[PDB]
């Protein structure tokens, strides 16, 4: 009963990072030689756990959480960073154990004259909280008056679009973000690496 | 992967063109994957004109966007080009392409040849 | 926004020429999406060589590129007689895309 990253990593759509997408995994071996042959592989990092030792443990709970950002706003998705996606979009707890997975995703996300089918907040009151997502579209008021609806003076749009082109140079291109989320404790775990008892 | 282009090869001044491609061997409802058209008047070098993708975006050559229009039909694999206003000068040789970002074309059609008269 | 080729391209069977493809401007960024294209008389444009220096499968070793500075160059080794064609290259731009005058390829013999 092979674990289905195939689902996560090679899904034909990724959620926009202001709704981000998550899924469960459980009851199933999670061999994680697979998922190296993505790319050249820009970015993989683990939190409290060794990328090398995951085929040789097993967790209660993990996660798969997918989006689409810039590539130099990789460097917010990590436990106490600050900056835009961090805050309003995205935020990792301090005490995050789990893995960061991303590559570049030019050649699928970008298109001729901008990919504008991604969004991401960029307006809010205050802060988020670990895994949190905001879905809401309502009207920011930024200014002492009711703005009701009405984009004038001091009111926005939460939302905007990255716009993507082939043109754009490293860094502002596209990134496809997988987060895996581990729980490693004494509670009765389901998904274990492939070893033979 | 195989692409055809139909349609009439006689137009007149101030009538529309219209051209409709079919494709086999391939979907165009793929990531990163979209049909383009290209045209070539005598003697000259290749004028790229629309390009739709498989979430009916539509992109136009900046010039000829207020002429130009693209559609498409999952149903039938069919694209069609039409363009209004056609002018004596409008005289091309008008290619089908299959249309991805790390090769802007390939897999060329044979073409169809269109004089305005 | 004008990609700058030389009208024509000669040599002699069995040695090799160089076929280039210059950007007038930065419009193109980071130019990193040159493709070629060898077009016979009478036939569809083939592509021979995509992101500046890639190969499509059935494309002879031949055919190769690379790019210094923001021009392409396309090499073509052991010059065949039926390497004569119309060569055109192709790039992205800002809100667009672009194809170059073309180059007409002759071999002698």
């Known amino acids: 009963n092979l674990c289905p990253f195939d689902e996560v990593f090679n899904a034909t759509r990724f959620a926009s990072v202001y709704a981000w997408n998550r899924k469960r995994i459980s009851n199933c071996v999670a061999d994680y030689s697979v998922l190296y042959n993505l790319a050249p592989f820009f970015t993989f990092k683990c939190y409290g756990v060794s990328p090398t030792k995951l085929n040789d443990l097993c967790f209660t709970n993990v996660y798969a959480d997918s989006f689409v950002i810039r590539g130099d706003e990789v460097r917010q998705i990590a436990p106490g960073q600050t900056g835009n996606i961090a805050d309003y979009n995205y935020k990792l707890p301090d005490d995050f154990t789990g893995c960061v997975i991303a590559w570049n995703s030019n050649k699928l996300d970008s298109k001729v004259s901008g990919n504008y089918n991604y969004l991401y907040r960029l307006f809010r009151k205050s802060n988020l909280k670990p895994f949190e997502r905001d879905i809401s579209t309502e009207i920011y008021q930024a200014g002492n008056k009711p703005c009701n609806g009405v984009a004038g003076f001091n009111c926005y749009f939460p939302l905007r679009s990255y716009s993507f082109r082939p043109t754009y140079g490293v860094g502002h291109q596209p990134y496809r973000v997988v987060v895996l989320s581990f729980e490693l404790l004494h509670a009765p775990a389901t998904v274990c690496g492939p070893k033979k008892s | 992967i195989t692409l055809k282009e139909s349609g009439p090869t006689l137009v007149k001044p101030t009538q529309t063109l219209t051209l409709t491609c079919t494709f086999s061997?391939?979907?165009?409802?793929?990531?990163?994957?979209?049909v383009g058209w290209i045209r070539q008047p005598p003697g000259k070098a290749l004028e790229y004109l629309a390009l739709?993708?498989?979430?009916?975006?539509?992109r136009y050559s900046t010039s000829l966007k207020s002429r130009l229009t693209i559609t498409k039909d999952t149903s039938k694999n069919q694209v069609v080009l039409t363009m209004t206003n056609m002018d004596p000068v409008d005289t091309a040789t008008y290619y089908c392409?299959?249309?991805?970002?790390?090769?802007?074309?390939?897999?060329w059609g044979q073409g169809i040849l269109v004089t305005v008269s | 926004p004008v990609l700058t080729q030389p009208a024509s391209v000669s040599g002699s069977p069995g040695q090799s020429i160089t076929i280039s493809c210059t950007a007038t401007?930065?419009?193109?960024?980071?130019?990193?999406?040159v493709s070629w294209y060898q077009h016979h008389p009478g036939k569809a444009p083939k592509l021979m060589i995509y992101?500046?220096?890639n190969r499509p499968s059935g494309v002879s070793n031949r055919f190769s590129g690379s790019k210094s500075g923001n021009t392409a160059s396309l090499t073509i080794s052991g010059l065949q007689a039926e390497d004569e064609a119309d060569y055109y290259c192709?790039?992205?731009?800002?809100?667009?895309?672009?194809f170059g005058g073309g180059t007409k390829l002759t071999v002698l013999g």
């Open positions: 992101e500046v220096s």
């Open positions: 392409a299959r249309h991805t970002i790390p090769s802007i074309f390939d897999y």
């Open positions: 739709i993708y498989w979430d009916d975006d539509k």
């Open positions: 401007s930065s419009d193109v960024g980071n130019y990193n999406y």
């Open positions: 192709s790039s992205y731009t800002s809100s667009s895309l672009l």
């Open positions: 061997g391939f979907s165009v409802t793929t990531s990163g994957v979209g």
